[PDB]
């Protein structure tokens, strides 16, 4: 059951930027200790 | 476009900085002049569209139709088009919600979303195309419809506002010419009188409409809410890719209602030019307004020098009549304000260089000063902040005692009128380019009008053809030709008779026609060298041609007028049009398109004639019929057939549609040549069936056209019911949704495949392409050149070794014909060689396709043809006889099969590369492309009438040739109802009773269903036991095969495999039956079984399968209670035997018994209850359990036959309301036996 109600957090753009910084889809892992 | 928007942001900024240009004294003058005009005409202002307006849904339907016409040509749509069509369909499906929405936007909305701009490139100038939001566009379109309807009711626009509904632009020029002629003493120059013709424009009329003053004038006209909407709508943001500005000064041309604003602002400036007095004299009184070029009195005509005045959208045309006093006074004023001491007015004066030297305007000082002075006086009447009039864009022409001509140019063509009283010296009338325009009072021709096409319209047509040659869908050959035909008929049906008087336009037509033909040829690559056949272009699109129209003197060669046919006698060569003539010259369009003067004379005639016809047809009380209407179908100014438009009652509310279609150029990106007309109101206005008909007659007739094609390769008996099928090609969803226009660089000739296949016996000729002429792969096809899609077609037609299999199927069939005629001729045994299989596609040599082994000797004859008669002679050549079988693929140059046969005989028997066992054999040549066959060789007695009948049989029954023909029809997508396999239809019924074994097969009662109601009430469908009815019409033996319900476990919805189970059971029955009782013919009642049985009897190749037009009542035989109880009570499939001729053949002929049985079964099918009563009237009459029908003497059989005959005939006459006492015997036969 889905409820329509005005929230409290009210997600913003800088929250999207901060949660987008931690995705890390371009940081290759370092080579293993050989 | 980027430079234009830089300059346009500059202009809007300079307007917001430099204030109004309008100089408010001048704006008060404009406003006050408009107020005095509107109170002079007693104008009633347009209200807000009312809440219960009775005409509102009509105008809404009209506006939605005009918005839907924009996205009709294309089929690629983005999101904005999808939203726009969704809103149009919602406004159809709920009109009152849409009208509430429109009226709510008209009351409230005043800020609007941004509009887009792009430019249509017309190659000489650019046209703005505006992109408005869909909701706004619907509201604007309804507003435009309402404004034009209320403006035409209230008579807002006087008749000089020229794009009016009941006037084509050539009718406008014609009315202008006869209005000049019908002015009082207009050509007299005796006391000193001048005529002046000024033609100019309002240079930046659109660009300079101040929106505040526009609000003021619209609040004079319409309600203040409507005027505020129309003013605030013009002030939007214009976007292009980066660029955003605000239209603060000009107007937006692309708004749906901008046409109304333009024509009304032009009315205001017409009041500025003419003055209120002369404009009121032209409009007449409001209680009795006059039409366009007519005054109230002769005295009101000559009151002022301005005589005639029209305004096309931003083009001005005034006519002036001056006495010498007024002329000298106005020249004095011009020379006062602008003196000329060096006589330099004759230098900068432009004259028309189209006309010859005697025909142009002379340069006299008085006439040049008068033209410049009249231009000066009209130029001073307009403030440069409102609009201006420039000398470099205008043309003035003065008719005087020194000038015998006045030149003018009103619509897209120019014309000069010359009176007979002035210098003509030869009163002639022969040219169709002229107009003999008569004076009204005297009913005598005073002047001639000479018509040429303007150079700008010629350059417009040339740029139109240049656009056709661009636009990357220009490699489709029907896209090109249809765009060419549309542009050509737009040009001709606009400029009808002015085209032949203009020689440069005719040369331009020939040049552009050769250019688009060269584009098609380069699309086939064709070569630079000529003798490409013009039959592929001008052939109507129904015969597979392009349907290309023509306006140039092109001729077809005499070598194209050759054709042929192979009948039972042999090959017959027919020829078109040979006595000595070369007059085969492509029927070009000017003869078949009526000139405008004939239109204008004929139209009043046919409308008065139709009025009298429907007046006498309503007093005689009959509704109008298609014949008397067909007398005058394609004739009239609005074209009499327009009275039968789908909706005439809603087109009575569509006003102002000329200017609306002329301003669709700023809304729609597509340019149409019919910007001046529309078929909804004006009619079709051209008809080309005579043109198409004698195009077919000029190319050589239908027979002479189709010999250029692979029509003979398709092997249809006739050409009549052939329908083409562009709905199943590769242009499909994958092609439509293919994204990436570089796809259309390799796959660009794949639309052209069918065309290239169809005309392939002329494109792939030696005399069209000088070429290396390689042989195609496993074929006897030689490809001349590298035609882009022909090889794909010929590989897909001859897929999986079709030449080899056709060859070894004709060899085997001809051997099998020789395998049964041993004891008629002199034989021992026929034998088939096993040569290398690479001999079918070997043109240089061949070896031996059969070898005969004659008993003693054969005095054969001599080499002759297959279609020769006589002359048996020389030496005997024991034991040896060879035939060869050559398969060729002929073209138009070389498909004479007899000449080919004798040529290959004389080339193969007289060399060392091909070695034959004997010198006494024959080769048989077959042209697969034309289905021709012949032979040439040594014919021994009793062989030629065998080979004639044998080849005639094999050329229509070979299963390999069937695969060839069906693959050709497959690749050509060409279909046919009216010819089929020849049925049993009427005349073949006598052949039912021969010595052969013939079957009737009826599967009508196989898949029978019973419907019953469930607990839901919803009706469901359950099967019952069915049967297959097989009947002998020559013995009477019956095969009843009961089809049980169990098989139907597996679909039980629509079935569709029933036909297949029936064909499978018939094939299994013939398989179990011995070879003595196998049928020769199987004739089926239902045509749908003709294809499955022919599949399942491929193991039995000797069975002919025929359909019946003559239907038989064999379904009624299972209505009998014995058969019904045998079927419905059964639980196992079984074959039951019967005989419906019960004991009749002891005393009756098979056909009499069959006719009696058809009478009985048809009476059971219709009479029922009454047939059973009449056939069983007495208890003492009995029937035997080994039989079906009662034992009767022959007279009793005659009695019951006459009775059931009356049962059939009376019920036919009852169900068709016809008398049975007037029927002829053939009609009675067609009622009883089959169906007429």
């Amino acid at each position: 059951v889905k409820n329509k109600a005005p929230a409290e957090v009210q997600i913003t753009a800088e929250q999207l930027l901060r949660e987008a910084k931690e995705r890390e889809l371009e940081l290759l892992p370092p080579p293993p200790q050989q | 476009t980027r430079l234009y928007l830089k300059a346009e942001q500059e202009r809007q900024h300079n307007y917001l900085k430099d204030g109004p240009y309008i100089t408010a004294e001048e704006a008060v003058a404009v406003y006050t002049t408009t107020v005095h005009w509107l109170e002079s005409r007693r104008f009633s202002p347009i209200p807000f569209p009312p809440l219960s307006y009775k005409h509102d849904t009509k105008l809404l339907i009209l506006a939605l139709e005009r918005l839907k016409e924009a996205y009709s040509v294309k089929s690629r749509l983005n999101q904005s088009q999808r939203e726009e069509l969704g809103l149009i369909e919602q406004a159809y499906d709920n009109p009152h919600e849409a009208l509430s929405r429109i009226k709510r936007h008209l009351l409230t909305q005043r800020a609007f979303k941004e509009v887009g701009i792009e430019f249509m490139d017309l190659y000489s100038h650019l046209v703005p195309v505006y992109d408005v939001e869909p909701l706004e566009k619907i509201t604007d379109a309804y507003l435009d419809q309402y404004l034009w309807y209320e403006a035409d009711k209230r008579r807002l626009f006087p008749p000089w506002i020229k794009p009016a509904d009941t006037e084509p632009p050539p009718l406008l020029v014609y009315k202008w010419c006869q209005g000049i002629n019908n002015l009082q003493d207009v050509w007299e120059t005796s006391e000193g009188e001048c005529n002046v013709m000024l033609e100019s424009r309002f240079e930046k009329m659109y660009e300079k409409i101040d929106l505040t003053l526009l609000n003021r004038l619209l609040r004079l006209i319409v309600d203040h809410n409507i005027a505020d909407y129309m003013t605030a709508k013009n002030n939007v943001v214009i976007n292009y890719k980066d660029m955003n500005h605000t239209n603060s000064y000009g107007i937006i041309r692309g708004l749906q209602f901008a046409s109304f604003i333009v024509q009304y602002y032009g009315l205001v400036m017409d009041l500025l030019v003419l003055g209120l007095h002369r404009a009121s004299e032209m409009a007449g009184p409001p209680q009795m307004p006059n039409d366009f070029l007519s005054f109230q009195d002769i005295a009101t005509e000559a009151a002022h020098p301005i005589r005639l005045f029209c305004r096309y959208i931003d083009r001005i045309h005034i006519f002036f009549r001056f006495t010498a006093d007024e002329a000298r006074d106005l020249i004095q004023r011009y020379l006062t304000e602008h003196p000329d001491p060096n006589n330099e007015n004759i230098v900068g004066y432009n004259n028309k260089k189209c006309w010859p030297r005697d025909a142009r305007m002379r340069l006299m000082k008085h006439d040049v000063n008068l033209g410049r002075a009249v231009f000066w006086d009209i130029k001073n009447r307009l403030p440069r902040s409102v609009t201006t009039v420039q000398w470099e864009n205008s043309f003035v022409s003065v008719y005087s005692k020194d000038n015998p001509n006045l030149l003018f140019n009103m619509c897209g063509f120019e014309c000069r009128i010359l009176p007979k009283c002035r210098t003509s010296y030869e009163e002639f009338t022969h040219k169709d380019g002229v107009w003999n325009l008569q004076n009204e009072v005297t009913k005598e021709r005073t002047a001639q009008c000479f018509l040429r096409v303007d150079d700008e319209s010629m350059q417009r047509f040339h740029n139109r053809v240049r656009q056709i040659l661009m636009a990357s869908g220009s490699t489709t050959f029907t896209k090109i030709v249809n765009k060419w035909n549309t542009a050509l008929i737009g040009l001709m049906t606009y400029f009808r008779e002015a085209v032949v008087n203009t020689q440069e336009l005719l040369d331009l037509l020939v040049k552009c026609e050769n250019k688009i033909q060269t584009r098609i040829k380069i699309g086939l690559n064709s070569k630079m060298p000529s003798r490409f056949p013009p039959v592929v272009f001008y052939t109507p699109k129904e015969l597979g041609g392009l349907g290309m129209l023509s306006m140039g003197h092109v001729l077809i060669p005499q070598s194209d007028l050759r054709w042929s046919k192979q009948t039972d006698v042999g090959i017959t060569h027919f020829r078109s049009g040979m006595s000595h003539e070369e007059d085969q010259l492509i029927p070009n369009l000017y003869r078949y398109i009526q000139p405008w003067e004939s239109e204008f004379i004929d139209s009043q005639r046919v409308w008065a004639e139709y009025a009298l016809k429907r007046q006498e047809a309503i007093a005689q009380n009959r509704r109008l019929t298609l014949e008397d209407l067909e007398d005058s179908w394609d004739r009239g100014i609005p074209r009499i057939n327009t009275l039968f438009q789908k909706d005439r009652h809603t087109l009575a509310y569509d006003k102002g549609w000329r200017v609306r279609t002329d301003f669709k150029q700023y809304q729609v990106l597509k340019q149409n040549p019919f910007w001046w007309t529309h078929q909804r109101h004006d009619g079709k206005l051209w008809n080309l069936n005579n043109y198409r008909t004698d195009m077919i007659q000029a190319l050589g007739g239908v027979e002479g056209i189709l010999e250029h094609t692979l029509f003979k390769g398709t092997y249809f008996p006739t050409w009549e019911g052939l329908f083409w099928e562009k709905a199943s090609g590769f242009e499909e969803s994958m092609k439509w949704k293919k994204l990436t226009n570089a796809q259309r660089s390799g796959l660009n000739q794949i639309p052209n495949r069918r065309f290239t296949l169809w005309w392939s016996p002329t494109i792939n000729r030696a005399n069209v392409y000088v070429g290396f002429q390689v042989q195609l792969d496993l074929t006897g096809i030689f490809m001349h050149g590298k035609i882009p899609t022909l090889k794909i077609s010929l590989i897909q037609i001859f897929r999986a070794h079709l030449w080899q299999k056709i060859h070894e199927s004709i060899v085997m069939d001809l051997c099998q014909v020789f395998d049964q005629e041993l004891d008629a001729l002199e034989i021992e045994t026929v034998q088939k060689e096993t040569i290398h299989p690479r001999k079918s596609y070997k043109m240089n040599s061949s070896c031996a396709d059969i070898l005969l082994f004659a008993s003693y000797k054969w005095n054969v004859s001599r080499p002759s043809l297959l279609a020769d008669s006589k002359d048996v002679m020389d030496s005997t050549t024991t034991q040896k006889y060879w035939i060869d079988i050559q398969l060729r693929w002929g073209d138009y140059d070389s498909h004479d099969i007899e000449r080919y046969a004798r040529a290959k005989f004389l080339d193969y028997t007289t060399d060392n590369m091909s070695i034959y066992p004997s010198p006494t054999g024959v080769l048989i040549a077959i042209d697969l492309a034309y289905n021709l066959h012949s032979a040439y060789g040594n014919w021994f007695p009793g062989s030629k009438p065998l080979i004639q009948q044998a080849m005639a049989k094999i050329m229509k029954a070979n299963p390999a040739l069937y695969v060839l023909r069906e693959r050709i029809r497959k690749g050509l997508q060409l279909y046919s109802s009216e010819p089929t396999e020849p049925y049993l239809s009427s005349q073949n019924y006598g052949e039912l009773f021969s010595n052969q074994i013939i079957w009737f097969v009826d599967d009508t009662n196989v898949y029978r269903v019973t419907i019953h109601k469930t607990f839901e009430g919803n009706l469901t469908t359950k099967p019952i036991n069915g049967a297959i009815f097989i009947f002998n019409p020559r013995t009477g033996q019956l095969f009843l095969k009961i089809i049980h319900t169990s098989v139907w476990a597996g679909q039980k919805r629509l079935g569709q495999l029933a036909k297949w189970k029936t064909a499978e059971e018939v094939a299994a029955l013939i398989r179990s039956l011995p070879v003595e009782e196998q049928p020769k013919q199987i004739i089926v009642t239902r045509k749908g079984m003709l294809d499955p049985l022919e599949v399942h009897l491929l193991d039995f190749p000797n069975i002919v399968i025929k359909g019946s037009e003559l239907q038989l009542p064999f379904q009624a035989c299972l209505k009998v209670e014995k058969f019904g109880d045998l079927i419905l009570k059964a639980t196992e499939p079984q074959m039951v035997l019967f005989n419906l001729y019960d004991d009749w053949l002891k005393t009756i002929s098979s056909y009499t018994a069959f006719s009696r049985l058809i009478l009985i079964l048809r009476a059971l099918h219709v009479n029922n209850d009454r047939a059973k009563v009449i056939l069983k009237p007495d208890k003492t009459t009995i029937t035997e359990p080994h039989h079906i029908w009662p034992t009767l003497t022959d007279e009793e059989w005659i009695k019951v036959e006459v009775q059931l005959k009356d049962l059939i005939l009376a019920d036919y006459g009852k169900k068709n309301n016809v008398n049975v006492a007037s029927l002829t015997q053939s009609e009675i036969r067609d009622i009883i036996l089959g169906m007429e």
């Binding site: 997600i11 753009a13 999207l16 | 005043r110 941004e114 003013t231 605030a232």
Partner: protein
């Protein structure tokens, strides 16, 4: 089947997408917000999300210049709006 009412989530994704892609790539921003087109994203930006749009209360000299320009340029809110420094919709609404 595009548009409707704008929620806070779509507007914050629109703000972050203008921060990433700029004010000259609206079809890359409208690919990030379904049921909203590029014209709708551009209009929503310039009409409620540009930080030059004065969402504060109208002062006295602003509404005086508003009445002067609206008497001075009748129903020309796209022309009046850059002079008094408000959105044309806000300008029209406050004039009414």
């Amino acid at each position: 089947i595009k548009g409707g009412v704008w929620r806070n989530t779509e507007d914050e994704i629109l703000k972050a997408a203008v921060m990433k892609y700029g004010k000259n790539q609206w079809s890359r921003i409208a690919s990030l917000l379904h049921r909203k087109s590029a014209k709708q994203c551009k209009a929503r930006w310039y009409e409620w999300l540009d930080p030059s749009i004065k969402k504060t209360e109208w002062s006295r000299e602003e509404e005086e210049k508003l009445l002067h320009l609206a008497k001075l340029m009748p129903t020309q809110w796209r022309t009046i709006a850059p002079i008094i420094g408000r959105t044309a919709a806000q300008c029209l609404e406050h004039y009414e």
